[PDB]
Amino acid sequence: AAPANAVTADDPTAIALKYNQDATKSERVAAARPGLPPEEQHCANCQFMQANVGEGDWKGCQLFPGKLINVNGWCASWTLKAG
Ligand code: SF4
């Protein structure tokens, strides 16, 4: 079950970025964002995931202030975690 502050499918920014809590139900292949092949991309390996926010599988994303994403999710702002 998601947390009360989870990013949801109805959030305008989530819609614009094509976020899904489950990267296997995402359009990562169509987007072909650079840095890894698309099937390898999800929030856990994204530069914007905040590992010190949230708990368990539900972590922060810098782009979604006050909310939580799932580490197994994806959106079109996916960017390789480089530091
Ligand atoms: S920016 Fe990165 S961490 Fe945030 S929802 Fe998109 S893929 Fe996940």
Swiss-Prot record:
It holds the Pfam family HIPIP. Thermostable. GO terms for biological process: aerobic electron transport chain. GO terms for molecular function: 4 iron, 4 sulfur cluster binding; electron transfer activity; metal ion binding. [4Fe-4S] cluster binds at residues 43, 46, 61, 75. PROSITE patterns: HIPIP. Keywords: 4Fe-4S, Electron transport, Iron, Iron-sulfur, Metal-binding, Transport. InterPro entries: High_potential_FeS_prot (IPR000170), HIPIP_sf (IPR036369). Belongs to the high-potential iron-sulfur protein (HiPIP) family. Homodimer. Specific class of high-redox-potential 4Fe-4S ferredoxins. Functions in anaerobic electron transport in most purple and in some other photosynthetic bacteria and in at least one genus (Paracoccus) of halophilic, denitrifying bacteria. This is High-potential iron-sulfur protein.
